[PDB]
Amino acid sequence: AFKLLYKTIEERKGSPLPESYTNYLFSKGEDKILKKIGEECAEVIIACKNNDKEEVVKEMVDVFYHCFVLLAEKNIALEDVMREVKERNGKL
Amino acid sequence: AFKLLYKTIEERKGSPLPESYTNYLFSKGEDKILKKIGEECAEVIIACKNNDKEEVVKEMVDVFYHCFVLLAEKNIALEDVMREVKERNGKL
Amino acid sequence: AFKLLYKTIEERKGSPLPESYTNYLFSKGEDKILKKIGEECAEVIIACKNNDKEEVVKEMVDVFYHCFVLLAEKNIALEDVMREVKERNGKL
Amino acid sequence: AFKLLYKTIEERKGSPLPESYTNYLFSKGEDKILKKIGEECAEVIIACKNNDKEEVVKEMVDVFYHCFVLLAEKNIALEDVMREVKERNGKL
């Protein structure tokens, strides 16, 4: 599912649809995506303190979506992230 | 891999090892985890602006790890997150 | 000047003008202001890494403005902050 | 008081005392300070949601202190910030 989301974001980078939010992000670039990540992270904290589980899930996925858009924008392969996740898993 | 990481974090919540970082987080609770997420998010922004890909990957995975620890702490099932990811995928 | 800014924000809390941004913040409440602070903090980081001094100043003042709005909203006296600043000054 | 804090931080940049936290920040540089600002910002959010006024004040001043350290580090004059605060005041 995470791989599916990443692939979809990658497909938008090659076949741009100005109407789409992902393309809007790619056009505005790195700084726009980073601002979104910071904003979304604050939203996760606020949602968590409000004990709103549905909102925590929406905002956390929002953070993940923007992180993936950022990866694609900086040309960082998803597998590099997955390797790190596996390495981190082993440590634990 | 993401599921593997989550399961491992869940296993630590039931079988505590005070020596482990994950248990340290569960003992300090919600507020400690949230602070980590905010700090890590800032580190992702800084790393991205420094154009340090390796660091972006480490910090992003760091953000994901703490988000998963937070899910376990708030008793939010991983599948709830995955459902949201799939729904988000469909929209795109 | 910081005191002037705070006083002005306080005056808006008592004499609401729906057209104003400050009143918009008070009406939406705590969670809206906090989201703004997180977003603005991310903008400060981004601006600083871009080496854009003018932007750093605008965003930093933005952070300060929202922190003062937050103080007024939570009914925290400015002098309490100033006492802390002075105490911090002495430590240094 | 804010000017006093800034002046004190400036004095530390010229007469370094490795034992001091301010000099520790200047030595580690921009990225360390920015990380602190992000972390502190999260702490302000968490403290505010906890309704802990004393903590909100400590963390907010912490954010201000690190912003001033950042100004000194980037060689941004305090009056530039004050000009912006006054301009912002007039707009209101």
- Tokens in use for C78? 């400015």
Check CB contact under 8 Å for B46 and C42.
Answer: no
- Tokens in use for D24? 């520790």
DSSP B2-68: HHHHHHHHHHHHHS--TTSHHHHHHHH-HHHHHHHHHHHHHHHHHHHHTT-HHHHHHHHHHHHHHHH
Q: Which residues does A contribute to its contact with C (CB < 8 Å)?
A: 31, 34-35, 37-39, 41-43, 45-46, 50
Q: Which of C35, C36, C44 is nearest to C65 (CA)?
A: C36
Check CB contact under 8 Å for B45 and C45.
Answer: yes
Q: Which residues of C touch B46 (CB under 8 A)?
A: 45, 49
Q: Which residues does D contribute to its contact with B (CB < 8 Å)?
A: 31, 34-35, 37-39, 41-43, 45-46, 50
By Cβ distance, the residue of C45, C51, C92 closest to D37 is C45
* Close Cβ partners of D1 (under 8 Å, ≥ 6 residues apart): C82, C85, C86, C89
Q: Which residues of A touch B34 (CB under 8 A)?
A: 44-45, 48-49
The secondary structure of A4-18, three-state, reads HHHHHHHHHHHCCCC
Domains and CATH numbers, chain B: 1-92 (1.10.287.1080)
Task: Return d(Cα B68, Cα A85) in angstroms, integer.
Answer: 12
Q: Which residues does B contribute to its contact with C (CB < 8 Å)?
A: 38, 41-42, 45-46, 49-50
From residue B15, alpha-carbon distances to A72, B18, B20 in Å are: 38, 10, 11
Q: How far apart are the first and last CA of chain A?
A: 23
Q: Which of C33, C22, C15, C86 is nearest to D89 (CA)?
A: C22
Q: How was this structure determined?
A: X-ray
